[PDB]
Design a protein around this ligand. Structure first.
Ligand SMILES: [Mg+2]
Ligand SMILES: [Mg+2]
Ligand SMILES: [Mg+2]
Ligand SMILES: [Mg+2]
Ligand SMILES: [Mg+2]
Ligand SMILES: [Mg+2]
Ligand SMILES: [Mg+2]
Ligand SMILES: [Mg+2]
Ligand SMILES: [Mg+2]
Ligand SMILES: [Mg+2]
Ligand SMILES: [Mg+2]
Ligand SMILES: [Mg+2]
Ligand SMILES: [Mg+2]
Ligand SMILES: [Mg+2]
Ligand SMILES: [Mg+2]
Ligand SMILES: [Mg+2]
Ligand SMILES: [Mg+2]
Ligand SMILES: [Mg+2]
Ligand SMILES: [Mg+2]
Ligand SMILES: [Mg+2]
Ligand SMILES: [Mg+2]
Ligand SMILES: [Mg+2]
Ligand SMILES: [Mg+2]
Ligand SMILES: [Mg+2]
Ligand SMILES: [Mg+2]
Ligand SMILES: [Mg+2]
Ligand SMILES: [Mg+2]
Ligand SMILES: [Mg+2]
Ligand SMILES: [Mg+2]
Ligand SMILES: [Mg+2]
Ligand SMILES: [Mg+2]
Ligand SMILES: [Mg+2]
Ligand SMILES: [Mg+2]
Ligand SMILES: [Mg+2]
Ligand SMILES: [Mg+2]
Ligand SMILES: [Mg+2]
Ligand SMILES: [Mg+2]
Ligand SMILES: [Mg+2]
Ligand SMILES: [Mg+2]
Ligand SMILES: [Mg+2]
Ligand SMILES: [Mg+2]
Ligand SMILES: [Mg+2]
Ligand SMILES: [Mg+2]
Ligand SMILES: [Mg+2]
Ligand SMILES: [Mg+2]
Ligand SMILES: [Mg+2]
Ligand SMILES: [Mg+2]
Ligand SMILES: [Mg+2]
Ligand SMILES: [Mg+2]
Ligand SMILES: [Mg+2]
Ligand SMILES: [Mg+2]
Ligand SMILES: [Mg+2]
Ligand SMILES: [Mg+2]
Ligand SMILES: [Mg+2]
Ligand SMILES: [Mg+2]
Ligand SMILES: [Mg+2]
Ligand SMILES: [Mg+2]
Ligand SMILES: [Mg+2]
Ligand SMILES: [Mg+2]
Ligand SMILES: [Mg+2]
Ligand SMILES: [Mg+2]
Ligand SMILES: [Mg+2]
Ligand SMILES: [Mg+2]
Ligand SMILES: [Mg+2]
Ligand SMILES: [Mg+2]
Ligand SMILES: [Mg+2]
Ligand SMILES: [Mg+2]
Ligand SMILES: [Mg+2]
Ligand SMILES: [Mg+2]
Ligand SMILES: [Mg+2]
Ligand SMILES: [Mg+2]
Ligand SMILES: [Mg+2]
Ligand SMILES: [Mg+2]
Ligand SMILES: [Mg+2]
Ligand SMILES: [Mg+2]
Ligand SMILES: [Mg+2]
Ligand SMILES: [Mg+2]
Ligand SMILES: [Mg+2]
Ligand SMILES: [Mg+2]
Ligand SMILES: [Mg+2]
Ligand SMILES: [Mg+2]
Ligand SMILES: [Mg+2]
Ligand SMILES: [Mg+2]
Ligand SMILES: [Mg+2]
Ligand SMILES: [Mg+2]
Ligand SMILES: [Mg+2]
Ligand SMILES: [Mg+2]
Ligand SMILES: [Mg+2]
Ligand SMILES: [Mg+2]
Ligand SMILES: [Mg+2]
Ligand SMILES: [Mg+2]
Ligand SMILES: [Mg+2]
Ligand SMILES: [Mg+2]
Ligand SMILES: [Mg+2]
Ligand SMILES: [Mg+2]
Ligand SMILES: [Mg+2]
Ligand SMILES: [Mg+2]
Ligand SMILES: [Mg+2]
Ligand SMILES: [Mg+2]
Ligand SMILES: [Mg+2]
Ligand SMILES: [Mg+2]
Ligand SMILES: [Mg+2]
Ligand SMILES: [Mg+2]
Ligand SMILES: [Mg+2]
Ligand SMILES: [Mg+2]
Ligand SMILES: [Mg+2]
Ligand SMILES: [Mg+2]
Ligand SMILES: [Mg+2]
Ligand SMILES: [Mg+2]
Ligand SMILES: [Mg+2]
Ligand SMILES: [Mg+2]
Ligand SMILES: [Mg+2]
Ligand SMILES: [Mg+2]
Lengths: 88, 92, 100
RNA sequence: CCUCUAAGCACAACCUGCGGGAACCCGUACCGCAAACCGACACAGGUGGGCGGGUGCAAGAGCACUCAGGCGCGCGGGAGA
RNA sequence: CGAAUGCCGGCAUGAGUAACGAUAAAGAGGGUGAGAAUCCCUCUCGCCGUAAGCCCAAGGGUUCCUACGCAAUGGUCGUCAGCGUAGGGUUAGGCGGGACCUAAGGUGAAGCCGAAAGGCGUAGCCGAAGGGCAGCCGGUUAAUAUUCCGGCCCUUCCCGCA
RNA sequence: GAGCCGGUAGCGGGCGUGGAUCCCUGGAUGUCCGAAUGGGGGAACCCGGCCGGCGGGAACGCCGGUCACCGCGCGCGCGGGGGGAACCUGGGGAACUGAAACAUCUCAGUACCCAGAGGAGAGGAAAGAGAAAUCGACUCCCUGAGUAGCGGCGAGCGAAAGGGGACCAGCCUAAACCGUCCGGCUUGUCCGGGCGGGGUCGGGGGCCCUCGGCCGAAUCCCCAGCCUAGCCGAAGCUGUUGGGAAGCAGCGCCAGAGAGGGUGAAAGCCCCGUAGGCGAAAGGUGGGGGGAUAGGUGAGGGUACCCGAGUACCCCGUGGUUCGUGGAGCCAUGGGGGAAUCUGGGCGGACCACCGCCUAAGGCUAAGUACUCCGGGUGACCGAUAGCGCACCAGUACCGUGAGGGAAAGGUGAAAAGAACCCCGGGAGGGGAGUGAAAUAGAGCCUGAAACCGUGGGCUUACAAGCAGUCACGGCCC
């Protein structure tokens, strides 16, 4: 997917099982295949002027923290570079 | 870089026939090789060249490897009717 | 480089072969084949020419290279290897001692 | 190519003739139904387009012969199982 | 090292045996040459003739042509060759492409999406035996010729005059 | 420091002891393609724009600049882009295999792909390790140890602590607070934004009045030394057979040099060398040696100010570690809930309470270690089918559309003295002559075996029968 303020997606195994499970009886595993857990992504739209992010939606309050700002500069037309490099 | 264009003439039975109409075919510098080398032949032989043609010649050879010398462009001047001069009539 | 050796175009004894001990003149160094020519090996070249000119009379044909680890140089001495004396500005070849 | 106006220019710019000038780079040889291409071969195979004459048979790019042109197929000589 | 249907190299055997690559077809006289059925010329004979003839693209690249050769390659021989050596030879405002255009399809600012490679994608650009654009006829050497030259015509541009 | 004009052999053509050829260092020119970068492109080619230059000229030309795209700051400027035999980190990541089938597992986080980066990379100063009122960054090597463990508890995989070593080093930042300033507004004695000053378990810091106070960089210029050319470097003559002496012999000599090579063979004393010792104008290089800079010097006691936030913690999903769901901690984190800042927070293998340990959610950090396209030396390493695939014009010919595969092929002799001149032949090839010690060393030529193919001689066979021989006699030339 993407990143915009966070780290990219990861790679998981699956690890199926078909058992009772230790606290009942004998356990097992079955098949270790690669689920590819694409991280939660939401196109958020903010009004710096018209700006759009692909933010992680556990980081929507973080991008509203980034919008609750006044970084002294007017419009070149696009400008998320000064919103993302004046991030901490 | 005007006398580094007209490399050499060719003594040949065809470019001895150029002295009846149109002055002799020179091997010219095969890159930076324009047909407006008229200001590379009239600035060299002090003539007034009307028409120039152009070519690309001289392929392969044996003895272990190929390309007999070069592949040099060569052509001529159809210089004005009797400014044809500049001692060339030697050998032909 | 490595190709420099005993001496140069002067007179020199050869202590080689049939000519074991012969004082030849100016030697005309080869030296990529590491020889000279000097005056010794005088073997006949049974050749006409490459250009067919002034044909075969006799053969008083010319010399041979003579590998240059056997041309002992000379001075008022016999043999006695060359040395270097510099005298603060030069590099001269002085033998095992006489001079020169 | 023809045309209309924006921008702009209306001391330009196009248009028509007449005078002079300039016209660059590459290809061009040769084979091209083949001995030169593609098939290891001077390979009976494959290969796109154009012309492909004459007379005859109903016609025809057919078929038979034959102009022009090009070949006799790069082993032959015998013998007559 | 003796074996692995071993590996590489060599030389056998098969074997002077099958073949020599179209049942279109040769014969003769002169040459040339050391040497000839095979090279050149002549005169017949045959074969294709909607090609087995010309021309152009594709491709191959100097095989083109001339002269010196014949070890090698030509399924024979070879003076011949397309083979070897050297030398010549390919001339364009008008033919074909590019200083023009687009089709499919590429590439692709913008934009999108992908873990990265990258995958898309608008405009644009590239993209051609399609459109557009100004040439016909004759001669010349050993080879080129719509190029060279001869005649006639025509195109673009730039400058000047009206 | 005397010969050169590369692998020259030939035109003969010049050039050098007023210094060349060479080799090194520093420039200059570097066409075109290539990250290709003005645009296009089917790489090595086309087609441009702007500026400046040559009826050489206004049109086509050519020259010399500049014209890609992206990232960083104020149209303006500094980097980036691709390549590299391996080495390394991260993102992905198999399968054959092994389990004597196989799916969990193993192979394996291997190969491979991608990104990145550099002479190294990585990691790194503790929210560590785990039993010690302990160790104190990280990495590497050996131990620990095939241990602890994990494990269809099968196959197998397999630490970490401790302990020896190498090496050694710690530091910057909001561990808040003060001023600055484009503007924010409800003009607020104030919100966040950039710097700046503070700030790094006289447990930390900021703020409040005693008691005042310079160690040293990873950074910078220096200098050895190192390379990148080189240089000086000891001492043997004669006779002998010989083609040739260095062999043999006699009389010596050097040795901080008796390593090796070549010299017509067997050379300490002929050459090149070696031992030893000099050498850098120019560039790289380098605290190894000293120099300065930048930085460091609510010790005290308080008013609970600040100690890195969608983070820790919890659950769900997983990877890493020895850990395969197990009693599953820890480290990472894709989803969801979601805190506090020292009577905080994490860890000490569920968890809980004592006792300890340590400060996450920001970054840098030499050194030791892996590597070998490269240069050098070293070999109980190979000697042309070996060693690289290539000792040779080889990643070539040849095969393949292509990715790719991919050969064979060294040696005349001391020296070319590489065969003048005949004779046969068209020539090739011979036979003489000549060279040379040797020419069955004569040219893709040392030795040149065998298979094979011939010729000459001896014995032997055309009424014979055999896995080809063997034993026995007999005959015949040695
Ligand atoms: Mg299990
Ligand atoms: Mg598996
Ligand atoms: Mg929304
Ligand atoms: Mg042309
Ligand atoms: Mg040829
Ligand atoms: Mg000097
Ligand atoms: Mg003109
Ligand atoms: Mg033609
Ligand atoms: Mg055709
Ligand atoms: Mg033909
Ligand atoms: Mg073919
Ligand atoms: Mg075939
Ligand atoms: Mg044929
Ligand atoms: Mg054919
Ligand atoms: Mg057809
Ligand atoms: Mg009919
Ligand atoms: Mg027919
Ligand atoms: Mg035939
Ligand atoms: Mg019959
Ligand atoms: Mg064998
Ligand atoms: Mg066997
Ligand atoms: Mg055996
Ligand atoms: Mg074989
Ligand atoms: Mg054979
Ligand atoms: Mg038979
Ligand atoms: Mg038969
Ligand atoms: Mg037959
Ligand atoms: Mg017939
Ligand atoms: Mg017929
Ligand atoms: Mg010909
Ligand atoms: Mg022959
Ligand atoms: Mg033949
Ligand atoms: Mg002849
Ligand atoms: Mg030829
Ligand atoms: Mg014209
Ligand atoms: Mg045209
Ligand atoms: Mg142009
Ligand atoms: Mg175009
Ligand atoms: Mg389109
Ligand atoms: Mg695309
Ligand atoms: Mg464009
Ligand atoms: Mg077209
Ligand atoms: Mg057309
Ligand atoms: Mg022709
Ligand atoms: Mg032509
Ligand atoms: Mg007309
Ligand atoms: Mg030279
Ligand atoms: Mg000098
Ligand atoms: Mg010089
Ligand atoms: Mg030089
Ligand atoms: Mg220049
Ligand atoms: Mg370019
Ligand atoms: Mg481009
Ligand atoms: Mg091009
Ligand atoms: Mg002028
Ligand atoms: Mg001018
Ligand atoms: Mg330019
Ligand atoms: Mg700077
Ligand atoms: Mg890169
Ligand atoms: Mg498996
Ligand atoms: Mg198995
Ligand atoms: Mg199985
Ligand atoms: Mg594993
Ligand atoms: Mg490092
Ligand atoms: Mg780090
Ligand atoms: Mg610490
Ligand atoms: Mg260990
Ligand atoms: Mg330890
Ligand atoms: Mg330790
Ligand atoms: Mg220390
Ligand atoms: Mg502020
Ligand atoms: Mg601070
Ligand atoms: Mg106080
Ligand atoms: Mg210094
Ligand atoms: Mg010093
Ligand atoms: Mg040096
Ligand atoms: Mg010396
Ligand atoms: Mg010495
Ligand atoms: Mg002897
Ligand atoms: Mg020796
Ligand atoms: Mg010998
Ligand atoms: Mg020796
Ligand atoms: Mg020394
Ligand atoms: Mg220096
Ligand atoms: Mg200096
Ligand atoms: Mg350095
Ligand atoms: Mg902290
Ligand atoms: Mg939340
Ligand atoms: Mg925890
Ligand atoms: Mg268990
Ligand atoms: Mg507390
Ligand atoms: Mg913690
Ligand atoms: Mg702990
Ligand atoms: Mg815990
Ligand atoms: Mg515990
Ligand atoms: Mg480091
Ligand atoms: Mg180390
Ligand atoms: Mg070496
Ligand atoms: Mg050996
Ligand atoms: Mg050896
Ligand atoms: Mg070999
Ligand atoms: Mg080999
Ligand atoms: Mg051998
Ligand atoms: Mg090679
Ligand atoms: Mg091919
Ligand atoms: Mg020799
Ligand atoms: Mg002869
Ligand atoms: Mg032989
Ligand atoms: Mg031999
Ligand atoms: Mg016999
Ligand atoms: Mg009987
Ligand atoms: Mg009998
Ligand atoms: Mg029997």
């Amino acid at each position: 997917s993407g990143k915009r303020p966070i780290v990219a997606n990861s790679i998981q195994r699956r690890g199926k099982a078909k058992r009772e499970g230790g606290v009942g009886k004998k356990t097992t595993g079955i098949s270790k295949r690669r689920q590819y857990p694409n991280l939660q992504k939401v196109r958020v739209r903010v009004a710096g002027q018209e700006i759009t992010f692909r933010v992680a939606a556990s980081h929507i309050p973080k991008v509203y923290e980034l919008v609750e700002r006044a970084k002294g500069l007017k419009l070149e037309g696009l400008s998320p570079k000064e919103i993302k490099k004046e991030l901490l | 870089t005007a006398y580094d264009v007209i490399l050499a003439p060719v003594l040949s039975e065809k470019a001895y026939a150029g002295f009846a109409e149109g002055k002799y075919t020179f091997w010219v510098h095969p890159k930076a090789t324009k047909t407006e080398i008229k200001n590379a032949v009239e600035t060299a032989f002090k003539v007034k060249v009307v028409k120039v043609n152009t070519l690309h010649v001289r392929g392969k050879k044996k003895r272990l490897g190929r390309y007999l010398g070069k592949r040099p462009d060569r052509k001529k001047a159809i210089v004005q009717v009797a400014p044809g001069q500049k001692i060339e009539a030697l050998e032909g | 480089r490595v190709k420099m050796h005993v001496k140069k175009g002067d007179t020199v004894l050869v202590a080689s072969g049939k000519y074991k001990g012969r004082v030849g003149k100016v030697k005309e160094v080869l030296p990529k084949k590491y020889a000279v020519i000097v005056e010794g090996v005088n073997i006949v070249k049974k050749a006409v020419r490459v250009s067919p000119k002034y044909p075969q009379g006799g053969f008083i044909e010319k010399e041979a290279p003579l590998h240059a680890s056997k041309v002992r140089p000379i001075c008022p001495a016999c043999g006695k290897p060359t040395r270097v004396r510099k005298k603060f500005l030069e590099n001269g070849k002085k033998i095992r001692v006489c001079a020169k």
